[PDB]
Design a protein around this ligand. Sequence first.
Ligand SMILES: [Fe+3]
Length: 329
Amino acid sequence: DKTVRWCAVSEHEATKCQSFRDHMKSVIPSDGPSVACVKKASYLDCIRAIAANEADAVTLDAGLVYDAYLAPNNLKPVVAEFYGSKEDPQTFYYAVAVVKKDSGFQMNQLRGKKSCHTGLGRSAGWNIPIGLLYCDLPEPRKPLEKAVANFFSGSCAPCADGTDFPQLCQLCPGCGCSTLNQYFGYSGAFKCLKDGAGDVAFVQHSTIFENLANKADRDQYELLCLDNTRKPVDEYKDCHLAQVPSHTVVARSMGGKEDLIWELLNQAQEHFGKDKSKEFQLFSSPHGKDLLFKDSAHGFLKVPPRMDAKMYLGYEYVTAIRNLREGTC
Ligand SMILES: [Fe+3]
């Protein structure tokens, strides 16, 4: 029982959140957990708000789960999204690089091309691809933003500082950090490629399938494999850049309401999970893609007792992030 203040990032998420609240109100008893919606402009404002007791929960891509864990925020992962299916839940997804058919370049010929990223610091859209190209970048590789801006001939890196690194917002002026920026996120990064602004989009394996319904339209795209070859989009399992951890809901380490967060999400998935309700869907929305939770998620899994971000993420992934911040070739 009682309220969970969910942090919505911008307008579209705020709208889905209010629908969430209302529908949960009609199915959950008076003694059940309720939702309240707190709208912020960016995920970073959501992280600050939770730490300052202005909100209670927000779902974050795993690369951002690390930042949320750092002081003075010290948030912890409490609920994880899972993909694939209820039968065989997967707590990871594949980072891939999508390109247009016959564009004529491999992974080792990315210098000078234009890039579309889901957002600064995110797993598939930034951490994995930039981590793999780190040494191909020109010195000085610090700050990272500068070297990336000089490697590509223009990008859209949402949440980056367009004032200090204008090239990173060339494809999306402002580098807006929310769905108000049409090239934000997985589907936004794909749109950036589809529209012709960029040459490559760093997204997840399911992104193209969530955006292109005809095999004929998808046959116009390919994936860049690490062996400097290209494969069709259905072959991501044999052509991906890395496997990364699921997006996860984070909460305060003190007075965090993790029990209510789990109670709310568990009930929510039972009533409004995949193919559960015709009235409301937790994992899709007429208002946008990946609002509050990823459209590709099938449900939630509780994170084990008192697990910190580092253990949750794993040594390899946390290493990759570290080596990206300081890193020596
Ligand atoms: Fe992600």
